[PDB]
Point group: C6
Chain length 261, copies 6
């Protein structure tokens, strides 16, 4: 559905239109770039619903919004607003350092970040409909996202090497998830939900790299709109994500991209 797509962060209706025209499969509405806020020491929260609504009114692709980790009231509000997806985001200032939102009590689907298999499974267990890497937001450095997708893949493989079901159960207990969840992953060799790349995806090559590592899609941040040519960069990232294993196409969209970050 969003599979194979690019979700783009947008801070205005006009940015959302550019995203849509470029071929984004969805847009992530936010009033403020948390990266900048974060480096300011400011508290970053759910965006003003009126701003999210102005973005929803400007495009016909799905709209996502972020809430603070554990902030189930921000989520209730965003859900009442009828956004299509809620990102329970570590990029905003966490509201609860112990508990994430009980996502399975909502009707709107959530995406959650994960750095490893344990995290991914706990998030899924809590009700996440979609997982993404945590990467390193606002840095334009793809290596954190790469590290997370590699780690989840590696841990899955390592768990498949355990030949005892008791050992498996002990791993599940350590992860704080139902053994049946872990066992399903080990049989299928993959998470039961889509896993998107997010955080530090700066170039078309970065996007294609994460797709080739096995991501189902990519989130790109506000860097797109700080580049000297946002429409061209946005379009190139979408093309790279679509044609992620076509080197000549990747060469063609990467050429003459102009000034980035």
């Amino acid at each position: 559905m969003l599979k194979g797509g690019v979700i783009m962060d947008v801070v205005t209706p006009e940015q959302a239109k550019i995203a849509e025209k470029s071929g984004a499969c969805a847009v992530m509405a936010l009033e403020s770039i948390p990266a900048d806020m974060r480096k300011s020491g400011k508290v970053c929260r759910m965006s003003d619903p009126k701003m999210i609504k102005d973005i929803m009114n400007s495009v016909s692709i799905p709209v996502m919004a972020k809430v603070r980790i554990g902030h189930f009231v921000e989520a209730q509000i965003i859900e009442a607003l009828e956004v299509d997806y809620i990102d329970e985001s570590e990029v905003l200032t966490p509201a609860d350092w112990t508990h994430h939102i009980e996502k399975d009590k909502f009707k709107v689907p959530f995406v959650c970040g994960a750095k490893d298999l344990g995290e991914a499974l706990r998030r899924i267990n809590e009700g996440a409909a979609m997982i993404r890497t945590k990467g390193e937001a606002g840095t334009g450095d793809v290596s954190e996202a790469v590290k997370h997708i590699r780690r989840i893949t590696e841990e899955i493989k390592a768990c498949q090497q355990l030949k005892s079901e008791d050992d498996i159960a002990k791993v599940a207990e350590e992860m704080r998830v139902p053994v049946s969840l872990l066992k399903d992953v080990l049989e299928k060799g993959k998470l039961p939900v889509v896993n998107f790349a997010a955080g530090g995806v700066a170039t078309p090559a970065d996007a294609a790299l994460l797709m080739q590592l096995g991501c189902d899609g990519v989130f790109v941040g506000s860097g797109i709109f700080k580049s000297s040519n946002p429409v061209r960069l946005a379009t190139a990232v979408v093309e790279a994500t679509t044609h992620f294993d076509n080197p000549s196409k990747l060469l063609e969209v990467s050429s003459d991209l102009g000034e980035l970050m």
Copy 2:
């Protein structure tokens, strides 16, 4: 009496009138924002009784005032002034690092902060009429308040898991409170007094979040009056605290709030 209400910090009579009009159940008189003072290294004490009295004269809702931890003479003075409640506040510069005020020797009711069950019970044992979270004053970050309310709830539940009354008694001894106090809490599953949210409540969503977590009311700080639209923000926070489990109402009051913190 204040249950389900919002108490607002005010530094002038005109701010108190705004609080009253907005639907605040009470006002907390202070001559100086301790948050700013604190970051200045200044010593923050009881406010000048004349400034408190000017606030008392300007509204008909109850008025609270702060005194330094352990400062029983500041409390005697505030009590003679006939304020309605005394907040023995960690936000002011502590006067005694060992002993809190013997609040049960006063006729005026006290509110005290607590970070966990032990602290809450010691403060109640000393005579506190009301408990509030300590949160993180002046930061606009709700996570400390959330952490405290969660911790008290968790410790209560954990203590309910003990079956040895000797174990209970050992916990009470470690907490330095009468076992009968601890036992009453374990039976009722809750503190014998109201517990308010305080410190870092910045948005209507924050206020509702703490009510849903089981708080009985909320304190909001001077951030209200630093916002670009104080009356609107104050009103929205009161509405959210009242209708804390009505998402469409929460959506409505959160929309177009203007610039905060």
Copy 3:
């Protein structure tokens, strides 16, 4: 004699007159505020005898002067000057880090600071006629003074719990004082000399707080004269010290005090 009184630091003859008019029981002559000097890294010594004499000539209440810890020659000079009391003061730069002055070889009475029971007893043993808390000079934070008076009281009570006279004697040896001194304190439940509050007394409430904690009088520093209304503040502190147990009187003198510290 000085019991129940306020001693005020003064740096000029005119300040001494204000102190006297306000009802101070004595004045503490000093040419320089050691608090400011201290924060300058400067060495603070006995004041010039000429400045002290100019203060002695301007009032008819007793005059005190400070000497550096261990500086028995400064004390011999101040004694020859005929001041009424000598404060061997940790606020000045210590002259001897090992030995305090042999005060019992002087005719003029000394006051010494103490942070705990051991210190108080050694100072009394050396010949101090009066003890005062060490508080935290120049900070306007009363909590150090409170801590010292609480500590002395607590240690006395703890020693009263011992019932081996051998244990008592072991405590006296650790404190480096004659067992008869310690035993006298344990029987009477108090020091054999007056104990005054000093260091960080900034408000009338602070003064009364220390009296209620059991001090016999208070020293106040140069903060009085940095306030926007010195005469009013000085008078209020004297009144609070006199009527330290009268809340309505305390309320009355604390009101509309103006800008402090």
Copy 4:
């Protein structure tokens, strides 16, 4: 082929022409000096293919381009561009902190850095066609490059001292390479591929020093073009690399070189 040659970093077509005229055996195309970028905290990536192509069009010697460690999509793009060599470079911001590129799946040859024998063998095992020291890029300090070439030589000699084939196999396992690779190196006393000097080569003397230590060629950085006389310096470095064992020639090219770094 490149053996005995100098490869020069160039950031424009005109710099590439100078390199070629000076006698460089190849040029390393990069849009930005990663040294400067690095000290800016910026992320350094593959250069824009258009800038690389403009350099390829300006000279007839081979052109190299860098990709981030582990970034196999950048490499696929550069390969499609038909550069002659790909430098998987630790000077750019690493994309994968765990896995290097699977170089043996490409047709274009790669050069990789190595600090010791283990690193060199793993890079060769992954498919590197050429090894170079990692030196210390942008510092003009030759000692890191010297350290690496010395270390590889020393480790080879130390391994040649082992006479248990089991011990050899244990070393290969620790290095994570096939024992046959390690054994080949121990028999021939050298790596199976050319080893170039790179990082911190600032003077003709530095270039010759590394050749005498056994390197097969040298990479020089953008320092060449920051000197007061680039053509002269570039020519001198090429001459020194060619006549690395001829002291009078080395003297002649080192003389009157002008202002460096």
Copy 5:
């Protein structure tokens, strides 16, 4: 001879004349205040002999000069200059951190600093004709000098408590001095040479304090000449040193001294 006298640091012939007129028993010639130099990180050495000679030519009291610890050539030079005393001074930058000068190979007498009994005895053993405290030069804080004179006195007394000659010999070995030296001290209850106070003597009271603690004389530094009234201060210090146990005289010279340090 110098016993009971004040030696004053002087940096010019005119300062030396003031010292002489004031009643100084000797002058210490130095071209630069090492205190200021020290805080500048500068290396402080023997003063230019021409400057020392200009001072020797301006007064008829003895002149001293400083050399760096261990710098026996500076001493040979000063000796050839015919100064009356050489101060091997820790205030200058040490030339030898292991060995002091072999003073007994010179004809001119040396003064050396000591912080404790061991140091004093080693210096005497090396040939020092006179000992002084090290104090804390340029600080105007007398407490270091007090500490050293107290420590030497205490260690002497403690050694007199040893009733075994073997124990004594073990102490001497630890001190690295001949047992006969230590034994002479223990019998006489004092050092075999005069011990002067030096470092941080700022007031007449300070000078008299050190005399009453048992010093045989005092060194005062350049602080004298930075005071608002050098002649008056110099004269007062000499009088205090002469009449060190006459309190009314000490009172008289300490009065109206003007601005110090």
Copy 6:
């Protein structure tokens, strides 16, 4: 040949002429004061051969030049230039942190620094023709040079105390030198080559001090030429080095030297 002489650092032909006229036995050509460079973080290398040659052409005394530690190519170049001595200098930025130059493969004589006996012997073993202390270059503080000459002397004496030739051999092994080298030193009681003082020699007295400590000559740095009177200072240092045991001569040359460092 240089024994009993002063070698002076010079940065221009005119400075070299001054050195020559002053009686320097040799000059040390360098284009830059490494002391200043060092404090700038800059990399300091062999000087441009053209600047060295211009100095060689301006005087008829021997000329030395520095090369980086381990930089045998810089040495080959300087050797081809026909300088008289090569200083393998820790003052320049080391090129090899593991290996010094194989100096016995050169025809030109080398001087090397040493801090202790082990270092001196390894440098002699490698082929050094002359040893010098390392001192502390550019500081004008003679104590490091003093420390090194003292340490070498002390270690020689300590080794002479060993009676076990096996013990000797064990020391040689720890030092990484042939036992015959160490044994020759122990018999002769001295190094088999001249040992010069270097680093921090600022005054004529310093120079004489090091000669009396047993040095065979002295290196002085660029401090000479920063003094207010270079010719006078240079001449005084040469005279002091020549007449290093004549106090009245030392007095005469030390007088009225003007402003140093």
